[PDB]
Amino acid sequence: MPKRTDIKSILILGAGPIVIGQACEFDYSGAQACKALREEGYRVINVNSNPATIMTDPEMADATYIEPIHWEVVRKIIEKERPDAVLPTMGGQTALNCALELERQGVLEEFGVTMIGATADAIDKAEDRRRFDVAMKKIGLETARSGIAHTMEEALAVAADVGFPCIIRPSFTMGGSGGGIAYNREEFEEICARGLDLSPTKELLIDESLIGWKEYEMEVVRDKNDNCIIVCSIENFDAMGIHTGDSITVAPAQTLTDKEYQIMRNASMAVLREIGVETGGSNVQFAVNPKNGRLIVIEMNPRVSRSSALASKATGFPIAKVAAKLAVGYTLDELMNDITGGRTPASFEPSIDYVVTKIPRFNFEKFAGANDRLTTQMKSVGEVMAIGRTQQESLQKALRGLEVGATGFDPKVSLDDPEALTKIRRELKDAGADRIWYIADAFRAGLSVDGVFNLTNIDRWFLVQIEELVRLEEKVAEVGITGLNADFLRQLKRKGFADARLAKLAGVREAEIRKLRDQYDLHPVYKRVDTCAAEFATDTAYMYSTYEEECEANPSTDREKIMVLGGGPNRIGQGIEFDYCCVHASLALREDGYETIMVNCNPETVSTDYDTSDRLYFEPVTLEDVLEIVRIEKPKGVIVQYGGQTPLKLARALEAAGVPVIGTSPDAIDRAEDRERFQHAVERLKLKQPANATVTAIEMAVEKAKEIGYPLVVRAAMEIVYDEADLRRYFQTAVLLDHFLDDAVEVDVDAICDGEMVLIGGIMEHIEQAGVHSGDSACSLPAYTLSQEIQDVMRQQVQKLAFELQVRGLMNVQFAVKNNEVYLIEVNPRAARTVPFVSKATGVPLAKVAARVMAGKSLAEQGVTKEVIPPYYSVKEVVLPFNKFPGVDPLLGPEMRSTGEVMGVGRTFAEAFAKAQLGSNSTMKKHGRALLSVREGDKERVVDLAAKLLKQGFELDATHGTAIVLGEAGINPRLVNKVHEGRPHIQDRIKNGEYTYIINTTSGRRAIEDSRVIRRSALQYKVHYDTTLNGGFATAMALNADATEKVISVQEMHAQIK
Amino acid sequence: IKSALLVLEDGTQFHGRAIGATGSAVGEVVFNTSMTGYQEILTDPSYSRQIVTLTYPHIGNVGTNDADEESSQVHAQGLVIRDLPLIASNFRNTEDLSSYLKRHNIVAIADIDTRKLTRLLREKGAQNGCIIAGDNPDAALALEKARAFPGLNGMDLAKEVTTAEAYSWTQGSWTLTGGLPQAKKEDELPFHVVAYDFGAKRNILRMLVDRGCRLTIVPAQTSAEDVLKMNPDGIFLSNGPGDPAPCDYAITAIQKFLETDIPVFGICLGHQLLALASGAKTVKMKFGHHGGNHPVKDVEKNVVMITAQNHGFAVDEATLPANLRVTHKSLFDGTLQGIHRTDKPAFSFQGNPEASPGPHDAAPLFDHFIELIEQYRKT
Ligand SMILES: Nc1ncnc2c1ncn2[C@@H]1O[C@H](COP(=O)(O)OP(=O)(O)O)[C@@H](O)[C@H]1O
Ligand SMILES: Nc1ncnc2c1ncn2[C@@H]1O[C@H](COP(=O)(O)OP(=O)(O)O)[C@@H](O)[C@H]1O
Ligand SMILES: CC[N+](CC)(CC)CC
Ligand SMILES: NCCC[C@H](N)C(=O)O
Ligand SMILES: [Cl-]
Ligand SMILES: [Cl-]
Ligand SMILES: [Cl-]
């Protein structure tokens, strides 16, 4: 019943770097589990290669390991810490996969580690698709007609049997990874080869189509006494055929009769019982034929998931925390319900009095050639959530919270466009990321609810609500601001219309609608989340806005409050890193005595965990929403510097409206963010910046260009133009102009200014040269090649910039070093994404420190005045989503595409880099054949790389001019033909597995376009590849290290710091 | 603009919109937390003279259908919701909810802050209220009617919704596939249970049938003698509206059955009566239990079941005579949920094992009954 006694220490496996399909939700879950276990008295050990997580913060656990999530590495941790048990259900597919390998490898046996939460067998039963299917049949649940395949031949025969289109689902994958929908054979082979390959068990399940049926999911929790509860139900908005992760979804279910719901609830339970999950949570997914209620079991996830995080946020029932406790022996009835002030137990089914909506965040604009249609394989990079008393209020709020610039149903096509209905039709029929907008456009263009349904399969119950919102909008447009009487506006507000959407329709400024509401005293009220539809009281201040009567905010008059603004959904370049800082602001300030108020709506995060702060407002981070909160909270100060771009952009507006913004001023922010304003301060400071120019006209550039000197960084999506012709060519296709600093080292420096002094947090040398976005660059702390001398120049400049721009809290500075000269690239007057890594690396929690500075405690008062240089090296490496978008050229450049990062800790740089590289899922080997194909600039240094590879045992292949260069130096690689040259060529060789390493560098649009085949193959074929010579050298160095050799804990790391 | 308004005994007003019949409704206002099953709730006799507030905001999403009816009519005095959807959207739907309410002549209001309402009821306890839906709703009038309501405490409503004459029931449960099945032939049912109609849900009846019973529903007021005269294999005490305390007839009859060896099983009102007939005492809860997510533990098995609840009165554990042993309790508040006669084959459950709407978790209570039944037959 109560806590297990034969277990003292638990190893928790983390999820690794954030990638599409496996994101922040695992930092939230992992953190909750550390939390619960530590509270319960267990000794906690955990491994997670991603430094940007709260779960890896040293005070969160007993032995924290920021090391590559490899079995051999984990093997060393077990050996070293000797955990009695392992909890592998809080780290995504990464953890499940690892647990099972450890098991397979016999490591568990080896050290007598007991698997808790979920057994190995149970996990496999759910994870192996064939096993899963047999089990459903065993319990009389129905599944789609299908066939298992382990090879292409078997695969064809299944298709031959189910017909097109068919759904391909690999075993041992999640988030639609390695799968898809085949409309034809061609696509069938493509998807099929992909998943057999990606499937850890080389297995695919091929099913007949159920595209268009309704999609549902249930979150279940089961304890050892067999007690079983439904924590939340979710109805998808997008139908079957579009992955749940890439679908808009809402809770609770809406269109099922109680009769139908009971059957699904009963089937959900039966499924857990059958698979054998006896001590945790699981997600069961189903398909429902809207025509006759026919129920089909689609799958089950024996662990915490992105839906379970959403469900916790939605209901206030902390699934991961509960599950952790169950894993060690507790039963639901023994645990107390968190938010009901521990008054009721955890053994109950939550009841909510509101509607929860989740909308996915996409970033197709960063992936040009990518197929931007929605399918069974996730493509989204994040998600936002909204709570409203109604579905319309919920939806709209979510729409404005998505950070895509929408104010709600903003139009996509013009009323007067002759082709709009055709475009509308296409977007509906074949869902893209923009579908929702197009739906409203459809209603404005004349299609009926029925016509829309027909194209989309989205339930009419939703469609009608959106239609109703459109008609209301048409009314606003007609009546205008004059017709915005108190009754109507209130109506509008109740349906979730935003002041900004109303303002566009009425042709006035947002502020005008805002005043109007003030005049009429029309403000939202706040309701609290409480798991039980007000049946019991609550003491947690977990809130959402709504246009209702009674307000439950009940703010303190007692305390000095500090508000922290979140970043909204995660997207490329605005990830978990911003959230870590928000969380830290909150933890430090609360610890210090302030009443902390968090404002954010990312359901995946720790910032939105009601434990993180005193008060949580789960709202869109917009000017409207914020002012409403500030209105009633009257805080001492507001932090806008930690949430990324989102809150950064509200700064001035917030100050204009009288909000007490703390830390670096909105003006200051602007000075740094405005290029022009920035260029003058640099000048003022007498610093060095590359030559630049603002060109309007083409012919105005071409000249100015001559002025600046090529190459040039065309920045309206950046570009590096090499020549005059290049320039034109650009514009054509296509304004600032900056001289591109060719072959320079890029560096980032994070720091803190308190008006009195500057504290250097860290100097990070990037591996990839300037021109490769810093977010996509691997980097090292401390610098691995920069002279202390030039580093001193940077520290000075950082200092001068800090004081000049009046920074108060964090800042980030980016330089480019060329010919022993420091050039300023930019100043980011807020927390940068490098903050968590620098903090982990140096043991100083810079976001807590900088937050104290913001609230008024100086560096000196806090005792943080000296730069810390660690005794070991920390290397950061990133993970790119290219494998999710095959049509894209997996090439680095000036624009950021990575989703996450990992950290490598070593005695030497080679050692850190090797850990970083392994942690990043690199397929690099220590032997084999390497293919070298480099650009002219690279021709010189390539020789040295080639010998290092030779010295290591590799054989070499080279294309034409590279072979020439190598030849002349004495290296004679095996010559290989380019695709044009003849056969066999690179493609063939790569396809055949001839290589284990590929080094391919290029320069010039055209040159890049041709060589596309190499990277594309390399990625497709899983061969490790570098696209920069600097990276190649870094890879060469790591060949000398052994990532599995030694492991170190964060506590130990930090203890080595003198 | 079809106005409506609800007023509680305390003076609180909620102005919204009329969504059912024109008129007024008076009763005790209660809240129900069920996210699905509004139709079933509406048609449960137990809701007699009560004004039902549903906390789940969208009520009506799936429309209505005959199979979802718990009785021949809508018993709820009135309906209080936050939002009526534009459309009903479900393959089983036969009529939109507004139409349905109108058709049943029900006074209903939408667009009010149901949360505020639930919070008041929770905090200050149950209150009587009144809804007026019409041209220009009289707030003073509504308050007066609310205040003039007698109240459910001491009110016998069982006699009021009971059948007039006894009847036979032999119809089992619905299936997705076959819907409601045809009534069975008496010879196909091994057992014969006599059911006391105190405002019985059809689902109770159907679940008994599913377990081998053939029944004879009898009016609330049936005598023990006439009852025993039927030679039943068991006796069933249905659920039903109002205060159980006043039903002196039932109590007496019951006491009468307890002298014999016939298995007796009560559900809800049936649970309270058994308790009363055994020397226990009933109380009116602060707000009671209405929802479908209520945890009740089988203490003899140390196990939890999520159940459907719909009761405003309860049995005091503290006054339990010695012959009554406690079998289940609420995990939300510890109230008494089940009892069993130590000396007789008589037991009851406060919650609704038949659900409709709700979790199927407590179905098994029915099996114990059969068990008892068969045992009595062995004799
Ligand atoms: N027979 C099917 N027809 C159509 N779509 C399907 C079918 N089976 C699954 N899908 C779709 O594919 C998605 C992914 O399948 P799922 O089994 O959940 O794999 P994953 O484990 O990757 O999340 C579902 O969310 C659903 O929209
Ligand atoms: N003048 C330049 N020379 C070389 N590389 C540059 C130059 N300007 C920018 N870059 C490259 O472009 C990247 C992004 O430019 P930056 O001004 O920092 O844009 P962002 O605001 O997107 O962070 C840098 O990290 C760098 O690799
Ligand atoms: C989901 C993340 N991976 C599969 C589990 C691939 C990036 C980690 C190895
Ligand atoms: N730090 C970026 C990842 C490097 C990738 N292997 C490439 O060099 O293209
Ligand atoms: Cl592994
Ligand atoms: Cl995966
Ligand atoms: Cl079908």
Ligand SMILES: [Cl-]
């Ligand atoms: Cl109007």
Ligand SMILES: [Cl-]
């Ligand atoms: Cl940043």
Ligand SMILES: [Cl-]
């Ligand atoms: Cl693609």
Ligand SMILES: [Cl-]
């Ligand atoms: Cl109201």
Ligand SMILES: [K+]
């Ligand atoms: K053990």
Ligand SMILES: [K+]
């Ligand atoms: K699965």
Ligand SMILES: [K+]
């Ligand atoms: K099947």
Ligand SMILES: [K+]
């Ligand atoms: K879907």
Ligand SMILES: [K+]
């Ligand atoms: K799911």
Ligand SMILES: [K+]
């Ligand atoms: K770089």
Ligand SMILES: [K+]
């Ligand atoms: K920037």
Ligand SMILES: [K+]
């Ligand atoms: K109202």
Ligand SMILES: [Mn+2]
């Ligand atoms: Mn899955």
Ligand SMILES: [Mn+2]
């Ligand atoms: Mn899935």
Ligand SMILES: [Mn+2]
């Ligand atoms: Mn930058």
